[PDB]
Amino acid sequence: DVHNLAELRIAGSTGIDAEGPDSGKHDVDLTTIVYSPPLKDNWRGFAGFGYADGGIVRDWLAGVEWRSRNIWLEAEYAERVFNHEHKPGARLSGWYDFNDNWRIGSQLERLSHRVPLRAMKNGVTGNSAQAYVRWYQNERRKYGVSWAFTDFSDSNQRHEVSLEGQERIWSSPYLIVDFLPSLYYEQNTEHDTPYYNPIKTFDIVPAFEASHLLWRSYENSWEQIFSAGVGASWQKHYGTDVVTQLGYGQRISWNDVIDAGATLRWEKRPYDGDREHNLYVEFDMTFRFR
């Protein structure tokens, strides 16, 4: 019956062949975080670790989480090291639920991950502010507005905006199919940069996702995830070309104590002209224990 215990989260990202502009062909992202048990009914403390080599960047972090329904909140401080150089970092985030159809979320970060993770090759520091609004119109219908402002340590400010939708097309005992149309807007300021800093980009990518169930017995299961998208990307001084994206993954859930998933992703969009392709693998695991 025990279901609120200590929790270990481990998630990772690695590039198979990422010929994109803000990532080398082969990069490695790994983050591991452990949550304490409910210290009391709403409070949890966590500590964690972050790793990124592509010149190696590591993170040591610790923070607290408060949790009731209708409102979730956490703060987090981290220390980031690079080439015998320490720099401080902190995160504040939360969401609350207005009416149980509407939810508003907020997020403050230093340093921000919304900065391409090594514009810091020249030591580019960034602090940001995120906000989002999510609205559930049916039980089969869901829209998400989001935006973020980011201040770089080289005078560049990035204002990103995203708008997502989630429409349920088909819901079977074994198969569900979602329509996930996505919109994205990004604007920057600094013009001659050593990192991919597009001045004004806008994308329209209609996409679907299909979750198929391979096997299930009662409270533990196994599913495969197929997702595909074809869209267009516009960039000022460069016009427009096509965006295509594919994903394949699988999920395992076991006794509400084991959750694991791994996804193989491919995408091909234009960066400053003609299209380059990104191929990478993502995974995540959550365990609950002593």
Q: State the DSSP string of 112-151.
A: -TTS-TTSGGGT--EEEEEEEEEEESSSSEEEEEEEEEEE
Question: Are 288 and 274 a contacting pair, CB within 8 Å?
Answer: no
Residue 189: which residues within 8 A CB-CB, separation 6 or more?
155, 156, 157, 158, 199
Alpha-carbon gap, residue 247 to 209, rounded angstroms: 9
Q: What are residue 99's phi and psi, to 5 degrees? A: -80, 155
How far are the Cα atoms of 49, 156, 206, 287 from residue 10, in angstroms, in the given order? 9, 33, 30, 9
**Contact partners, residue 275, CB within 8 Å, separation at least 6:** 241, 242, 268, 269
**Which of 127, 107, 105 lies closest to 115 in space, CA to CA?**
127
Nearest Cα to Cα of residue 203 among 230, 179, 168: 230
Pairing of strands 102-110, 182-187: unpaired
CA–CA distances in Å: residue 100 to residues 93, 97, 138, 166: 20, 6, 12, 17
- What are 91-96's contacts with CB under 8 Å, separation 24+? 91/63, 93/130, 95/71, 96/70, 96/71, 96/72
C-alpha torsion 66→67→72→78, nearest 10: 30
Contact between 137 and 101 (Cβ < 8 Å): yes
Range of the domain at 254: 1-290
User: Token digits for 154?
Assistant: 């080289």
- Note the Cα 102 to chain centre separation in Å: 21
Assess contact for 182 and 166: CB atoms under 8 A: no
- Please, are residues 203 and 222 in contact by the beta-carbon 8 Å criterion? no
d(CA 33, CA 62): 9
Q: How many domains does the chain have?
A: 1
Which experimental method was this entry solved with?
Answer: X-ray
**Which residue in the block uniquely carries the two structure tokens 């207005």?**
98
Q: What is the resolution of this structure in A?
A: 2.8
Do 158 and 152 form a contact (C-beta atoms < 8 A)?
yes
Sequence-distant (6+) residues with CB within 8 A of 113 are: none
DSSP 5-69: -EEEEEEEEEEEEE-STTS-SS-EEEEEEEEPP-SSSSEEEEEEEEEEE--EEEEEEEEEEEEET
Alpha carbon distance 255, 3 (integer Å): 10
